[PDB]
Structures are given as C-alpha cells and as structure tokens.
Write a protein that binds this ligand. Structure first.
Ligand SMILES: Nc1ncnc2c1ncn2[C@@H]1O[C@H](COP(=O)(O)OP(=O)(O)OP(=O)(O)O)[C@@H](O)[C@H]1O
Ligand SMILES: Nc1ncnc2c1ncn2[C@@H]1O[C@H](COP(=O)(O)OP(=O)(O)OP(=O)(O)O)[C@@H](O)[C@H]1O
Ligand SMILES: Nc1ncnc2c1ncn2[C@@H]1O[C@H](COP(=O)(O)OP(=O)(O)OP(=O)(O)O)[C@@H](O)[C@H]1O
Ligand SMILES: Nc1ncnc2c1ncn2[C@@H]1O[C@H](COP(=O)(O)OP(=O)(O)OP(=O)(O)O)[C@@H](O)[C@H]1O
Ligand SMILES: Nc1ncnc2c1ncn2[C@@H]1O[C@H](COP(=O)(O)OP(=O)(O)OP(=O)(O)O)[C@@H](O)[C@H]1O
Ligand SMILES: Nc1ncnc2c1ncn2[C@@H]1O[C@H](COP(=O)(O)OP(=O)(O)OP(=O)(O)O)[C@@H](O)[C@H]1O
Ligand SMILES: [Cl-]
Ligand SMILES: [Cl-]
Ligand SMILES: [Cl-]
Ligand SMILES: [Mg+2]
Ligand SMILES: [Mg+2]
Ligand SMILES: [Mg+2]
Lengths: 246, 268, 268, 246, 246, 268
C-alpha cells in the first residue's frame, strides 16, 4: 500500500494496565514470573498504564479547575511510576526502565543490550493535549498503539484486569447484561456508545494505522494468557484495526 | 456533592464512561495565563525571508510588550519541508518526520531570540509557565518554538507521512491550554481569500468567517493547518483566531490594539 | 593562622579526625538566603483537599509575597502512600520507595505552580539559589517540591521500608542549608496536641515545646516526621520551627507577621 | 613519540557528507545497505555532516547579521538531523543515534551493546566558535577528525559525493581544469588556495594530530568504495596527516 | 527476616579511594590492569572517591563560610572526576562512566551491555546534607555502601591506600602505637573515638543495613588483594555490619 | 542583490570557496549584548585565595551592577592543575583533560554564586542569552563558568596534552560572540610586566601594548593564555582587553568607570 517502512519489525509491544499494577504483589508477582519466562522468546517493549492514582490526581486537578492539558502530564507521571515498579522487579534479569526520549530514538540499541525494556505507555502530549473533554483523551492504550504502529512492530498486546471487551461494563451496574466479545473491529466499537476497557482514542488512531492489523486484549490476572497472546493464540478480545494484510 | 459524585465516578468507572465524562465536564474552569496573547511568527511566511521581514517585526514586539503580554512562537519553513521530502522518500513514518521538523522551528526561535536578547526577552522551552518574564514590565514576553511535542507519537494524517499537527497547531494548543485571551497568526498575506492569492488572480478577501463556512466554501486546508480548525471547534478558551500579514509595517501592533486587520476565524 | 592550621589538617588527616572536625567547626558562618522564609504546604493535610483548602492559601501566598520572601515546598500525600503500599508489598527497599514518592510531591508542585503562574511565581527545581525571583518585588517567591534528593541512596529507617526522610525533612533541610530566618509547616491542625487530635477526644493543645520535651512526652513521631526533630537539634541556622493550620483563613499570613499561631518547636 | 594512549584503538570512524544525505533515497538506500554489510566486520562510529540546509540557515542568519558563533549551532542541528535519518534506516540492525555527551564519555559501553552508532560530526564549539570568518570554521570533517584522533581510532574515512580531492572544483567554473589527486599531504593542501571538499580547519587539526596518519576521501555514490577504504584499499584521495608511524 | 528483595544479587561493588587515585599512574596503572583481569570474573560496579582535591575545595569553601550542604556537591565533583579518569583507562575494554541517575534506575541494562561500569561513590545528598559537622558526613564509603545494600549486592569491597583499619592513624602522630585490626564490627568501631580510613557515617548505615553482612577494606597498592577480596579471601580488615545470615 | 549573489554562492559552492568566504564577510554585523562587560575572575589568582580576595570582589560586583551590565566568568585554578597532572601522567589526551578542567571552573562558579544569591545574581550555564537577569536593574549581572565547551573536541597544542583553550579563552570568546563592549581579566598582578613579576626582581610595568609587540618582546605566553592573543587579532567585536589586579580594593570598579588601571592589550 506504499506504506512507510517498518523501523523495528521484530519488536513485540506489551501494554500493562495501570489497574493491573494497582492490585499489588498478588497480580504483579505472577505477571513478573510470566515476563521472566518470555524474555528469551521475544524482544519486548513493556509499557505501563496509570491506574487509580491518576483518578485521584484528576479529582484534585478537576477540583482546582485545571484544564485537560494540565491533567495529562499529571496522569502520565503515574504510568511512569508503575513502569519503575515493574522494571525494579525485573532488574535481576537485566531489565530497566527507559525514558520517552530513549524509547523514541534509542530503543534499537537498548534492545540490543538487553532482552526487554520497560517504559511509560502515556504519550508526551501533556499541555498540548487536545481540548474537548476535561479528561485527557490520549492515554496509555493510545500511546502504546501509536508507538507500536510507528515502529511497525510485530504486535501490540493489551494486558487487562478483565477477559476482554464486553457489551457493557462487567463490573458495573449493567453487568448481568454484559456479553463477551471474542472479536470486534475498531470501527464497530467507535460507533457504539458506552464504556470500554480501552481508550476511545485508540479506535481513532487504529483508523489511520499503517502496520498493526490486530490488537488483542487479554486478562493478565490469568497466568499464561499473555504468553499465548504473544504467539497469536486467541485468549481474549481481538480488535481488528482496519489495516489490510498484503 | 457533585464533587463527591465526580470522585465516585472517577474511582469506580472507566474514563471512557459517558457518565464520568459528563461529570468532569461540569468542573470549574481555571485560566492559567488569561491576559497573555499567543502570536505565531511564520517560518516560511516571515523568518525564512530574512532581515526585511524579521527586523520590523522585532521592532513591533519590543514596542508591543510595553502594554501587551506576549507568547511568541516560531514556525519552521523551507528547511523543514526539505527534511520532510528526504524522510518521506525513504519511507519514514509521520512520527519520525515530526521530530525532524521540531529542530527547524528551534533554529528559528534561536535566531529570533538572539535579536531580542538585548531587550530582555528570553527563549524558553514551550513556555506557558515561564511565569517570571511574563510578570515583569521590563520583559513581558517570551519566545518559544511552535512544534508540538508529539514527536514519534504524532498521529498521522489519513494519507501521507507529513505530520498533520505542526507549528500552527502547536501555537494554538498553547493558547488554548493556558486560557490566553487572544491567538494571532502572523503570515505573509493579508488574510484568508476565496482561493490561494499567490496562484489565483482574482481571489476575494474574507474579513470574518466561521470554521463551518470555511469547510463549506472548500478551504479547510488554506491559510492554516486544517487540523487547527477542528481544534478550534473543540477549544474551551480560545474560540476565535486572527490571521494578519506580518510583512505590513505595524500590522501586528494594530491587531494587538484591537483593530480588525486581517481575517477573524470563529469556531461557530 | 587558624586558617593555616585548618588547611594543614585538611591535607594531612582523614576527615574523620576529631582535630580536623573541630577546626572546621570554627569556620565562619555564611547565610545564603537569610531573609527568606521556607513554608511547607502539606500534601495530605492541604493539597489533597482541593479548592477549599488550596485556593485560600494561594490568596495568602500572593498577599504575603508583598512583604515576605517565600520558598514554598509541597508535600506528597495519599498518592505517595498508595505507591508506598504497592512497593512495600513487593518487598522493594526504602531507596526505591523514595524515588516513587518524589513524583507525587512533583505533581503537587505543578498544580500549585499553575495556580500561581499568573502572579509571576515560578516552579523551580529544589530552588535555593533561584536568586532572580526571590530578589524581585514583583515575584519574591518560588514553589518547589519538598522531597529530598536521596532517592536510591535514602537511608532506611531501623524497621520497615517507608523512607524516613520525606517532605518535612526536605523542606527543613532547605531552610537550614540556606540559613533562612524561618521555617513554617502548614498542616491541617492548629498545632501539636498531647495526642493525635483526630483519634483522641481530649488531647490538649501545646503552644510551645522543645524537642527533648516532645521525646519525653512520648510524641517523637506526631505532627512532624520524627527525623526532623533530630535534624532540628543538629541545625546551625534554623533552631526552631512553627506548625500552623492552613485550613484556617489567614493563619499563614499571621504567622509571617510574627503572631504565635500554632505550635513553636525549639531545638533546645 | 611519548604520545597519549589510544582510548578506542579498535574503532573505525566514518564521516558521511551532508550533501550525500541531501541526495535522498537514491544515495542513502545503497549506502545503508553497504553499512548493513559492514556491521559484522567493523566497530563503527558513523558521523553525519550538515549539507544544504545549513547553507539556507547561513543565508538567513547572515541576512539577520548574526555572528559566526550564532551560525555554528544552527548548522550543527542539520548534521544531527541527518544522523537521526541515517540511524532510523539502520534501527532494525540495532543502530541508534547517540548524542555528543554519550559519544564523548560513553561510546565504549554503547559499542559494547551494538555494532555501530550514529552521531553528529559537528563539534560542540557553538557560540565559542573562533572569530575571523563569518562561516563557522570547525565543521563536520574537522569534528570527525578531532574525535577520531582523540580516541586513537584505527582510521577515519570521509564519504563524499565526488571521487576525492581535485586541483579545482570538479562541479565548478574551472571544472575542465580540475585534475584528480590520488594522494596529498595536509601541509600541501593547506598552502594551496582554492576550494576543497573538506574543511580547511581539518588540515590545521591534522598538523597537531597524535595518532591518525592518513584519511581517505572516497565517493559514497559508488557502492563498494567505503567497504574497500575501510580495508585500506586506495579508491579515493589519501590525505597524509604528518603523524609519523613508529 | 522479612527483608526487602535483592534487586541485583549478582552484583559486586568496588569502591576505589580518592587518595589511591591521587597517587597517579604509579597506583592507577597496576589497579587498571588488575581490573582488566577481573572483568570476565565479576559483574562490577566500580565507584570512585574524592581524595585531596576535595580537601582543597573544603579549604576554600570553609574560608568563604559556606555551609555543609554547599561543600557536599563540591566534594562530589572530585569523586566524579576520578571516575571519569578511571573509566577512560578502561574504555578499550568497553567500560564507561555512568551518571547517578543511570546508576539508580538503569544499572541493570548497562551491566547487560558491558562487564563493568564506573560511577561516583558520593551520594546525591548535596544541599540536603545533614547539619552538625562542617564537613559533609555522607561521603564515598557511605554512598557506596548505601548503593550496594539497596541493590542487595553480593558484596562491597573498599580499596584503600593502607592495609586496613588500625587502632590509630598509621601515617599520623601516634603511628608507632597503631595496631592492625584483621576483623572488627561496625558497632565496635562506632563506639571508639579517633580517626578511621572510612566515613563514620558508614558505621551508621551498616547498623540499618538489610543485606550486606561484611565489608572488607584492602590495600589497593598491593596487586592481587582486590582480586583475592572479591573471592572472599581475608587480605585486609573485615567489617561486620550486624546483618545476620539466615 | 549582494544578498542574492551570496545565496547563490551559498547554494552552489563549498564553504571553503574564497568567493563564498568573501561574500559572507560583507554581511551586516549584529551585536547581541552590546552594553555588557565580560569579566573573568581568576581561579588561581583570586578564587583559590579564599575570603581575603573573594569577599572584596563580591562587594565590587554588587556595587558595580548598579551602573554596569556584567557577565562574570570563573577561572579554574590549582584543582584543575592537579587533575591535569594526574591525567597527563596516565597518557590521557588533551580532550580528556579539557573535560576535567571544566568541573573545577564549575565548582568556582558555584561558590561565587552562593555568595551572590542574596543579591539576586544567578549562576547560569554559559549565559549570553540569559536575557532576563541582564535586563533588570535589580540584577543586571550573571555568573558563569569560564571553560569553553570543546571537551573531547579540544584542539591540542603543538606539544603536550594541556588544553590550550581554557578559562581566559572561554571568557574572551563569550565577549566576542555577543559583541560586548568590554573584556576585563581579573588576576593577581597589576598587569603585564616585561617578565613574570613573581620570579624576576626588576620587571617593568607595561600599561599598554599590542599583540604584535607582546610577541616581539617574547611574552606571547605571559599573563594571558597565549591562544587568547591570536583570538584577539581575529576578533570582530572585542579588539582590546584590560588586565587588572583583583587583589587591589576597588580596582575592578575603577576599570568599569573607565580608569586605565592595569594593562590594555590591543589587537593592533
Ligand atoms: N465494555 C467493557 N468491557 C470490559 N471492561 C469494561 C468495559 N467498560 C468498562 N470496563 C471496565 O474497565 C476496567 C478496566 O479499567 P481501565 O481500562 O481504566 O484500566 P487500565 O487499562 O488498567 O488503566 P490504564 O488505562 O490506566 O492503563 C475493567 O475492569 C472493567 O470494569
Ligand atoms: N485561501 C487562502 N488564503 C490565503 N492564503 C492562502 C490560501 N490558500 C493557501 N494560502 C497560502 O497559505 C500560506 C500560509 O501558510 P504557510 O505554511 O506558508 O505559513 P507559515 O505559518 O509560514 O508556515 P510554517 O511556519 O510552517 O513555515 C500563504 O502564504 C498563502 O500562499
Ligand atoms: N500529637 C499530635 N498533634 C497533632 N497532630 C498530630 C499528632 N499526632 C499525629 N498527628 C497528625 O499529624 C498529621 C500531620 O501529618 P501529615 O503526614 O498528615 O502531614 P502532611 O505534611 O500533610 O504530610 P504529607 O505532606 O507527607 O502528605 C495531622 O493531620 C494529625 O492528624
Ligand atoms: N578541490 C575540490 N575537489 C573536490 N570537490 C571540490 C573541490 N572544491 C570544491 N569541491 C566541491 O565540494 C563538493 C562537496 O561539498 P561539501 O564538501 O560541502 O559537502 P559535504 O561534505 O557533503 O558537506 P558537509 O561538510 O556538510 O558534510 C563537491 O561535490 C565538489 O563540487
Ligand atoms: N585508624 C586508621 N586506620 C587506617 N588508616 C587511618 C586511620 N585513621 C586515619 N587513617 C588514614 O586514612 C588514610 C586514608 O584517607 P581517606 O580515608 O581520606 O582516603 P580515601 O578513602 O582514598 O578518600 P575518599 O574518602 O575521598 O575516597 C590512610 O592513608 C591513613 O593515613
Ligand atoms: N609578564 C608577566 N606579567 C605579569 N604576570 C605574568 C607574566 N608572566 C607570567 N605571569 C603570571 O601570570 C599569572 C596569571 O596567570 P594565571 O594562570 O595564574 O591566571 P588565572 O586567570 O588565575 O588562571 P586560572 O583561572 O586558569 O586559574 C600571574 O599570577 C603572573 O605570575
Ligand atoms: Cl475515552
Ligand atoms: Cl566522619
Ligand atoms: Cl573552510
Ligand atoms: Mg484499560
Ligand atoms: Mg566535504
Ligand atoms: Mg578511606
């Protein structure tokens, strides 16, 4: 399709949800042991989301009247703290946290030095966040996809605290009505109203994607599902981006 | 407490939840720099032209800072388009081009900054909260580079690898985020015309127009980056912009004084 | 020359040598910022509470900077305690927790800084030698984050992994190092009581007390980080601190005016 | 000669001319494929020059009346952009762009992590550029040699858009008079007047060089010549620095 | 003892005294050759102290009346210069100097890229140094131990210009009275008065240590003693920290 | 247009082309900081000497900034020469020594900066375009470290590994690049003598001399780094320098007032 080259075609990108990290050792320790076993199998860029502490800083910032561009870096800080925590648990394996500038221009050398690096999934929109909502739209899922597609990576896998995407919040008021979606397209999700486990802006950047054809959302609280998803096995919700294979 | 119910929603729901989104929309609205004006000095339209364009505009900035708080952002221009053409021909993606274009807007901020140094006006990073210079009457202005910080995380356009959010969008979003009172784009034409005035011999001048009317008249991508018009319709604070000719002596000074030179583009 | 004999000892002895230590103790004492006051704005006690607590304190800072030089440091609060609980449950050491808590105090400095930007007051790194803002009457104040820079080199407490030196200690050490005239801790209680006033129904207010008397009365770890009391007894410049209630309108203004609101804690 | 030690005696330094990069994919793609094949053979520090965009910023800066110390960092920016472009094309091989401070003090660890790194050939003289000419004298060729000689590298090879040094500009007005120089000494070039394909300041720093005995200028538009030059084959102009072999 | 995890349990930390470096090539060259032979045997974090130049800047700073928090970063600068010097001599082996932030959060990836890194042993207390003495208390020995214990490293070895700890300064006025101490506990040293070859603050942070059970002080002017100490051989003074083995 | 022909040459020729060089030489000449004076405070000659030398000079800087814009750079001194001797004995090259010496000039800028902080005068990086402090009457001065940024790219001298461009050259090049009006070197002797006044008992004082006359009289490497004399002959803006004794009370103040204390060295 006369598309841009793939910068890092051998790369696998994994996004860890901030609310997975929020569960502490009970969720993090099995995830760390699964990541340890995956290091010899894949070249991994592991990106962390923000979770509940960003909700609290949104609560204070919204109370102070701050605009959406003020809230964006405050939330991004919590994603980076989650990344430092995860990288600390993998340090004995040679894994460290790397900053956005290193991720942006020096990922190649760092993945030559070690098998995986951890970074923040929030993109550096910060005070240039788009207006409209008072909640920053370009969050962890969106930043992780923008990076993965810009690199031309082999995949992006989103590690969630639920099995995947449902027709309603499976932890919310309409939960007995929520039906599991094994597959969906980004366009079908975008034309629905209701909450999702992924940013609505993820669906927008999938519409302009150049390389990534599918993204799987899997439950990181079930050991083995991330491992299976990185081998292309269907253990969660597959999101079709609309990039067509050649 | 609507404050209480907002924090309940913030703790219990996904940020995608429409109920949470609607409760956040009711939050109070603080303007960080409400008395500042953001000005974009065009790269191609002004700075690339050298002394004959830049020196008069430096004089206007020095005179204007006496009564007007100024955030002055720089465009990129011909050197960025050279970089875009090299990188695009190599098949590099929009995110890589975005990083290259930033260096050029940085160059331009540096040159403008060295002409303004003896007048006390510094070059600062992005510069919204460069609170000290903008509070001193001896200074009351700063220079920054206009490229947004998205870099490798730039969202591509629907077609092609040219970054869709450039110096126009970077300067506009700064004005919107800090709740500034005014956004003025300084270019090399009197304002918006019914067609490109350089390639059509009887384009008509447009003094005032809405975003919807621009789109309907077929000029969504005319004198401003077309994503700016969509950002303008989403903005909370800056609901109109003015485009003026920086090559006309005193045109920026008169715009700051409230004169309707150029074109006023409204969100609605 | 005592200067000569000091330099002989400095060249010929280990820095552990008591003779060298005693000669260095006789050196002159320069105060870097003797007319500044350091203020800590509590994270949990103030900033976490939102507009009802923060907005009045912003008003007091703006009014107070007219006659008082201010170094304003921020606490961390509930988001840091969440991070500590996650990291501690993973078995991470105090040095790793120290780095996490710093990000939260940074967040708070950012939010306070954006409310103060239009008043000219900047956010600076640690900020002792941010000499220009503190010398201008139009500014005369800065905001900084209160966490000490120890990070991975944090000394752990005798038990547990919670960093023992947090925003109280970071703000105090800044006041001590720059030889400031005054250190005021802004919390959410009127001052020191004989017991925690939130969990005891008849605690008695204490207007003035020494460090030794606090330790003897069993409250070494009460309204201040307990290492601060030991740092206070070692200090060369700041030999007392005042703790006031930031939730009381005008309480910080009156403390700066020399009124004995709250509790005064003395090194001896 | 009681000369300083060699810091990185196994290093090979290659300087890519900015006007080579200016030719776009038609020149860059064959050069990238030649560099790919050289990675397993050599430990490479690849440094990029500035090219035509620096001429434009000189045109604007000279029009604004800016001094030579103002023009120097403006030109250096264009060399760094060329380096980011080249490194992007080699990212899938583990190559990244590295900044001047990394080059200056951490090159050893980075060349332990990967086979080659890309950096800017302009030296950080910037506003401490020497006065005299209104054109910054310490450019890409000069910075690349200063680095290579300070490191005690095994060589420096300069990759040009012409075969080497001629007795006149082979693309200029006196071009039918221009005669190819297979070898020359730096002292002989310095005592001539006329344009060269290399900085005149390169000749000055060769006069005080401690290690590098020869520098070859080769045509990077001819595939294979860089490969041959890195093996010591004479395929361009050899510049003798005046360092004597022991 | 329900102690924190070990971040880098395979790490060996070596602290080189600044007064060892002060002796110049006569001491540094044999030390560099011993370090070269140790690279394939251990994963080394080499940290340098400050030495005599810090005494001079203390002399000037104390003359100017500067407080202890002003003197701390001035001394730390000299430790970092010593580290740059040492790393330069090992550059041909892939060793580079790394900054405090890299040491603090990215040591794992760097020791994956190369066999050893050099850094400064002074901790970043700087203007938050504790008051009390006019001499900064948290120096090279103290910072090196804080790092080693925080990492859970396999050991810390302190390389001195004397055989170890004596009952008096073996180069001072009471030197014929000075008796060598093959072993001691940190608590026994802390309750003595008199000078030591290690920071008194080292003894304090050993009291709260979580992992490191012993630290050996060895004479780096005797080739082979650092090598032997890194194998657990008793060739200097052993300091027992009071951490108990399980 | 000479502007047109310059841009043709800039596009079509190598920058080594004499025709291009000559056309660039005809460009206009903008001075960035024309009313500032650059002062170098010697490391060995002043700062290494402690309070007796530094404290009076701090007083003069504070008094002088009332009527004179000051860029104050610091030398390095004895700690740099210790580092040079260690590194040179290891066979390290001039580029490595250059990086080591920079840290020492940085130390000295820090110490001077902490004595000046309460007077509003900051320590800035290199600091030409530190436009805000130099435009405020309350400040009107900055402190910077005098080492040039060449680091590993230092050109070596013809013999030896001592970096030939040190704090004298770094301070001079700053004055030249920003087109400052005056360059004053503050040392520990009254000025240039016919021989080193410390090791010759009847050297004669020289009030005024040219670079050529210094070279002819055999003192190219005397009171100033000898490369400075060659940089002086190439300079566009600063065509003379003055060397004064900072140990004489008020000597810097009188030089700033136009008194011919010390030695004036002219390019021609
Ligand atoms: N349609 C839906 N399908 C699945 N989960 C949903 C849906 N709507 C809401 N949710 C909720 O989204 C929750 C996940 O929250 P969220 O997406 O904010 O977490 P996260 O991805 O870990 O956070 P972050 O974006 O900070 O990384 C699920 O536990 C579920 O309750
Ligand atoms: N309808 C129109 N009315 C006016 N100008 C138009 C119109 N359509 C196109 N243009 C062109 O838009 C140009 C302004 O955009 P341009 O990108 O040149 O501005 P700039 O801000 O200098 O850009 P940069 O800063 O990115 O270099 C004008 O020079 C004009 O030729
Ligand atoms: N004896 C006592 N007198 C007064 N307050 C006490 C006493 N003992 C405990 N406290 C508690 O100490 C608290 C102040 O410490 P706290 O850590 O909340 O302050 P902070 O500065 O906001 O912290 P941070 O900035 O780290 O969030 C008070 O809210 C009070 O409940
Ligand atoms: N004597 C000469 N011999 C060879 N080429 C010459 C000579 N004099 C001028 N030139 C010209 O120099 C051109 C190369 O230009 P230049 O040296 O500026 O490029 P570059 O090295 O790619 O640039 P940069 O220095 O920015 O890296 C050749 O194409 C040729 O026309
Ligand atoms: N009890 C002691 N036992 C041994 N050496 C002692 C004792 N007391 C003093 N010293 C002296 O300490 C000297 C070492 O000095 P010091 O500890 O300052 O050096 P260093 O560790 O190289 O410096 P730095 O701390 O900057 O790294 C020895 O040479 C010895 O003279
Ligand atoms: N002919 C001369 N006239 C005067 N001084 C001379 C002469 N020849 C040598 N000198 C010496 O030059 C010295 C000044 O150079 P020096 O390097 O000490 O200055 P500095 O600026 O303090 O250096 P730094 O900042 O690098 O420490 C004087 O102290 C003096 O002894
Ligand atoms: Cl959303
Ligand atoms: Cl001690
Ligand atoms: Cl030249
Ligand atoms: Mg989610
Ligand atoms: Mg060339
Ligand atoms: Mg010691």
């Amino acid at each position: 399709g006369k598309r841009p080259i793939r910068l890092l075609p051998w790369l696998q990108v994994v996004k860890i949800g901030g609310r997975v990290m929020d569960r502490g050792a009970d969720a993090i320790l099995p995830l760390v042991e699964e990541l340890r076993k995956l290091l010899p199998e894949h070249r991994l860029l592991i990106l962390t989301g923000a979770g509940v502490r960003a909700r609290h800083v949104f609560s204070v910032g919204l109370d102070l009247g701050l605009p959406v561009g003020s809230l964006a870096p405050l939330a991004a800080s919590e994603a980076g703290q989650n990344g430092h925590i995860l990288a600390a648990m993998l340090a004995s394996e040679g894994v460290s946290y790397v900053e956005h500038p290193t991720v942006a221009d020096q990922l190649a050398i760092h993945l030559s030095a070690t098998r995986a690096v951890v970074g923040s999934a929030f993109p550096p929109y910060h005070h240039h966040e788009f207006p409209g909502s008072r909640i920053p739209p370009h969050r962890a899922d969106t930043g992780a996809f923008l990076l993965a597609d810009a690199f031309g990576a082999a995949g992006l896998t989103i590690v969630e605290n639920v099995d995947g995407i449902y027709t309603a919040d499976p932890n919310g008021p309409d939960r007995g009505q929520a039906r599991f979606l094994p597959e969906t397209s980004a366009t079908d999700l975008a034309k629905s109203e209701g909450p999702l486990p992924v940013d609505r802006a993820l669906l927008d950047v999938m519409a302009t994607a150049r390389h990534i054809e599918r993204v799987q959302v899997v439950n990181g609280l079930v050991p083995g599902r991330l491992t299976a998803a990185l081998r292309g096995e269907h253990v969660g919700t597959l999101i079709r981006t609309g990039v067509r294979p050649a | 407490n609507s404050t209480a119910e907002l924090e309940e929603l913030l703790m219990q729901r996904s940020l995608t939840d429409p109920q949470l989104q609607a409760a956040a929309a009711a939050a109070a609205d603080f303007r960080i720099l409400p008395d500042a004006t953001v000005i974009k000095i065009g790269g191609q339209s002004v700075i690339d032209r050298g002394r004959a364009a830049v020196y008069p505009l430096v004089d206007e900035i020095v005179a204007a800072r006496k009564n007007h708080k100024l955030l002055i952002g720089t465009g990129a221009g011909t050197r960025a388009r050279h970089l875009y053409s090299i990188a695009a021909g190599l098949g590099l993606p929009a995110g890589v081009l975005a990083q290259l274009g930033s260096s050029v807007a940085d160059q331009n901020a540096a040159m403008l900054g060295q002409l303004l140094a003896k007048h006390g006006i510094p070059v600062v990073g992005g510069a919204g909260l460069s609170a000290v210079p903008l509070s001193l009457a001896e200074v009351n202005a700063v220079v920054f580079s206009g490229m947004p910080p998205y870099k490798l995380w730039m969202r591509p356009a629907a077609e092609g690898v040219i970054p869709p959010y450039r110096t126009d969008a970077g300067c506009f979003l700064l004005a919107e985020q800090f709740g500034c009172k005014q956004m003025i784009f300084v270019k090399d034409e009197d304002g918006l015309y019914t067609a490109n005035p350089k390639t059509s011999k009887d384009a008509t001048f447009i003094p005032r127009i809405s975003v919807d009317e621009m789109k309907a008249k077929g000029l969504h991508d005319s004198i401003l980056e077309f994503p700016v018009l969509d950002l303008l319709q989403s903005a909370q604070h800056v609901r109109e912009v003015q485009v003026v000719n920086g090559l006309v002596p005193g045109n920026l000074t008169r715009a700051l004084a409230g004169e309707h030179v150029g074109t006023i583009i409204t969100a609605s």
